[PDB]
């Protein structure tokens, strides 16, 4: 089948967020007026949450667990696809073609995506996603 989907996790290869894991929300199949190529809307995380342990408590744990999200449009060539998957319904209506451009609507999108990804991480599920890829 066509494997790039709304579930799909991937590693971004080029441009600033290189070696940072993202999840695809809206795959455009072929092209538009801007972005004349096969491109996906994605929603990754820029700064990964640091390690955390039995020793730390309360305030030190809140500082350690904090995540910066990002959102971007990206080419299919620059995305390396991955067998893992993540459920995307918390930020379906947020991220979209209308949402990109017209700033600072981008900032209001990231606040919802922050509240998704941290809250996904508390009671941790998809453990591979929130670990940093080391290279």
């Amino acid at each position: 089948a066509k494997f790039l989907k709304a579930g799909k996790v991937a590693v971004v290869v080029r441009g600033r967020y290189a070696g940072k894991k993202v999840v695809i929300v809206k795959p455009h199949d072929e092209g538009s007026k801007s972005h004349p190529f096969g491109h996906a809307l994605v929603a990754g995380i820029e700064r990964y949450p640091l390690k955390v342990t039995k020793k730390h408590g309360a305030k030190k744990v809140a500082k350690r667990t904090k995540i910066k999200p990002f959102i971007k449009v990206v080419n299919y060539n620059h995305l390396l696809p991955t067998r893992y998957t993540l459920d995307v319904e918390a930020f379906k209506s947020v991220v979209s073609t209308e949402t990109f451009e017209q700033p600072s609507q981008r900032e209001e999108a990231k606040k919802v995506v922050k509240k998704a990804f941290e809250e996904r991480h508390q009671a941790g599920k998809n453990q591979w996603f929130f670990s940093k890829l080391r290279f």
Binding site: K54, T65, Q122, A123
Partner: peptide, 29 residues
């Protein structure tokens, strides 16, 4: 428990870097 994770380490032979061990036997006095 959720945020806590077990990472092991594999000191083994070529893999990993060896921890501090007592070398009192081997010290040059």
């Amino acid at each position: 428990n959720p945020l806590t994770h077990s990472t092991p380490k594999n000191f083994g032979i070529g893999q990993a870097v060896q921890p501090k061990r007592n070398l009192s036997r081997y010290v040059k006095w």
